[PDB]
Design a binder for these strands. Structure first.
Ligand SMILES: Nc1nc2c(ncn2[C@H]2C[C@H](O)[C@@H](COP(=O)(O)CP(=O)(O)OP(=O)(O)O)O2)c(=O)[nH]1
Ligand SMILES: [Mg+2]
Ligand SMILES: [Mg+2]
Ligand code: NA
Length: 322
DNA sequence: CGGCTGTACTG
DNA sequence: GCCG
DNA sequence: CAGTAC
């Protein structure tokens, strides 16, 4: 729908990122939740009591909401360390998180050029840096489509049965995608094996894969570029999963991140655990509470089965932003 | 006040 | 940050 | 393990 509280959320996201780039992840999280609630509220919040009655907004956040509602500004926004923009700049480099941004800043660096030349970069960060600009641009949905087909085409050349599906923001129907997350599996439950390596080599030869950021037996985080004049380098993820965990893999991979964590929260209450691998029962825990026995798996052939089992009404991918 | 998702590759 |  | 990321 429409965000009847934009005048508020914009001020808030500013403080939210402030805390975020600074490493205060938990406080940032509180704000993120707050903002998602604000956005999806049927009307402009008009009173402090009204704000509080909303889940994810407590005394503290309500105070801020009202001050903006009445002043159109948030005092808090004027006392934000002048280091935030540089920390944001540095943490925008894929592979570089808040600890690295903070390290570089105390070392005196202040620009990507400072980093590029002087600073010490891990192999990933170097890749993150050379593709800085391209990585902040959200690609058109159409380009995501092209990338999914590329992967799927190269994958079917090893097996016609292999199933390739673009997830994340793409399956949620967004018009722009930060990256492309492709999930690959196979109906027979066994053919997905031993093809990951060769599929990557194939795409790497074809020139499509330009750089590798992370290689796992079943997980791949890399960089790609479509054939054609002046195409940008797009960040790409690929995960290969056995057919049995397909529903969960697809659920996890479609996200969003907050929707996922929210489902996993609920899962734990009902005494269960939800992971990209499966929906299970309460894990066994000893006197201290330490995992000692994995819960048994509840078959979930489809995403619908996962919601059903958690007592939740099915939600289309496009309505899973959080 | 303590939890706030669960899991995985890199160095 | 918020919540149980 | 610390850091980063899905
Ligand atoms: N449980 C869990 N799932 C996650 C997490 N991060 C990502 N996922 C899942 C859900 C998420 O949908 C998927 C891909 O993550 P991205 O590609 O980083 C963000 P996307 O939503 O795709 O949108 P984009 O901004 O790319 O256009 O992995 C996380 O922290 N936890
Ligand atoms: Mg994505
Ligand atoms: Mg991704
Ligand atoms: Na980063």
């Amino acid at each position: 729908a429409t965000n009847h509280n934009l005048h508020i959320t914009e001020k808030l996201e500013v403080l939210a990122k402030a805390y975020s780039v600074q490493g205060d992840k938990w406080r940032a999280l509180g704000y993120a939740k707050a903002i998602n609630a604000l956005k999806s509220f049927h009307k402009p919040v008009t009173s402090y009591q009204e704000a509080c009655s909303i889940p994810g907004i407590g005394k503290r956040m309500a105070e801020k909401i009202i001050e903006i509602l009445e002043s159109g500004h948030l005092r808090k926004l004027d006392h934000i360390s002048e280091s935030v923009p540089v920390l944001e700049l540095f943490s925008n480099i894929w592979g570089a998180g808040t600890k690295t941004a903070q390290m570089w800043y105390q070392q005196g660096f202040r620009s990507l050029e400072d980093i590029r030349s002087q600073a010490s970069l891990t192999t990933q960060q170097a890749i993150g840096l050379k593709h800085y600009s391209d990585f902040l641009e959200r690609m058109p949905r159409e380009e995501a489509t092209e990338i999914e087909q590329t992967v799927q085409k190269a994958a079917q050349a090893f097996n016609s049965g292999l199933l390739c599906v673009a997830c994340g923001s793409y399956r949620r129907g967004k018009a722009t995608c930060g990256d492309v997350d492709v999930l690959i599996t196979h109906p027979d439950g066994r053919s997905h094996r031993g093809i990951f390596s060769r599929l990557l080599d194939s795409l790497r030869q074809e020139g499509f894969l330009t750089d590798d950021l992370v290689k796992g037996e079943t997980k791949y985080l890399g960089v790609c570029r479509l054939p054609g004049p002046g195409r940008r380098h797009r960040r790409l993820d690929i995960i290969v999963v056995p057919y049995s965990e397909f529903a969960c893999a697809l659920l996890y991979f479609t996200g969003s991140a907050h929707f996922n964590r929210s489902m996993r929260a609920l899962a734990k209450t009902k005494g269960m655990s939800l992971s990209e691998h499966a929906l299970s029962t309460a894990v066994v825990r000893n006197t201290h509470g330490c995992k000692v026995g994995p819960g048994r798996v509840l078959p979930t052939p489809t995403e619908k089965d996962v919601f059903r089992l958690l007592g939740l009404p099915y939600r289309e991918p496009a309505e899973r932003d959080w």
